[PDB]
Amino acid sequence: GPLGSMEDFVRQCFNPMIVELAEKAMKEYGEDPKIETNKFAAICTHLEVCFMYSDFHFIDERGESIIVESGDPNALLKHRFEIIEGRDRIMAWTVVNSICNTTGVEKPKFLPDLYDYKENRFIEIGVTRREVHIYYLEKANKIKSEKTHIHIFSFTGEEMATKADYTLDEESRARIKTRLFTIRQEMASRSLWDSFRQSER
Ligand SMILES: Oc1ccc(-n2ccnc2)cc1
Ligand SMILES: Oc1ccc(-n2ccnc2)cc1
Numbered sequence: 001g002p003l004g005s006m007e008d009f010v011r012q013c014f015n016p017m018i019v020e021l022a023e024k025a026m027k028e029y030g031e032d033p034k035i036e037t038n039k040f041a042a043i044c045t046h047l048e049v050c051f052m053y054s055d056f057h058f059i060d061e062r063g064e065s066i067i068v069e070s071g072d073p074n075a076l077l078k079h080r081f082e083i084i085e086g087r088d089r090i091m092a093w094t095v096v097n098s099i100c101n102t103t104g105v106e107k108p109k110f111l112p113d114l115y116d117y118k119e120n121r122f123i124e125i126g127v128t129r130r131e132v133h134i135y136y137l138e139k140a141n142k143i144k145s146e147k148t149h150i151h152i153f154s155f156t157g158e159e160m161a162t163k164a165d166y167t168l169d170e171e172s173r174a175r176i177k178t179r180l181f182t183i184r185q186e187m188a189s190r191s192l193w194d195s196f197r198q199s200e201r
């Protein structure tokens with residue numbers, strides 16, 4: 001089939017808020033989304049997975065974690081996750097340092113993606129086009145915080161998480177895996193997938 005552009009793919013399959021945040025992330029670290037286009041799509045994907053991971057999860061009036069998929073959560077509900085990803089470096093560390101001074105949770109060396117108020121820990125979300133065990137070890141060796149929980153998703157449905165503790169229910173993680181499957185399929189229809197996959201390196 002015809003080779004599409006990754007720019008068109010990103011603009012057509014990601015929400016404009018997500019695309020704008022990814023452009024900002026790349027600008028912040030001196031990269032151009034129109035040149036590093038596979039990285040651009042990977043950042044969009046990672047942002048979306050982090051938002052999907054936190055979606056619908058609340059802590060109820062008794063302090064227990066619950067799932068509310070309706071648009072209107074009860075007003076006494078607390079969001080279960082703090083989202084650190086998707087923020088500029090000053091604001092992201094402002095949110096982190098805060099949680100750390102507040103809860104007593106130690107400070108990470110690298111910015112994590114979420115904070116889980118149920119499990120009382122930071123989370124590093126990974127999305128890989130390679131094998132999850134390889135990618136898991138690379139991340140574990142990098143952060144080595146050992147209080148920060150790692151949860152890796154692949155595009156073919158495999159997952160790996162710290163201590164085999166997957167945090168979320170099957171249905172929530174299935175929403176994420178379904179979305180990743182969709183991204184891969186749509187990229188493949190545009191003849192973008194093979195190169196995107198091989199670019200992770
Ligand atoms: O090549 C890049 C650029 C920016 C990135 N980023 C900064 C903040 N969040 C993602 C990651 C990778
Ligand atoms: O000004 C911003 C906004 C979002 C950013 N970001 C997106 C994903 N990770 C960080 C970076 C910079």
Ligand SMILES: [Mn+2]
Binds near residue numbers: 073079
């Ligand atoms: Mn709300």
Ligand SMILES: [Mn+2]
Binds near residue numbers: 085
């Ligand atoms: Mn980021």
Ligand SMILES: [Mn+2]
Binds near residue numbers: 085111113
């Ligand atoms: Mn991050």
Ligand SMILES: [Mn+2]
Binds near residue numbers: 046124125126127
């Ligand atoms: Mn991450």
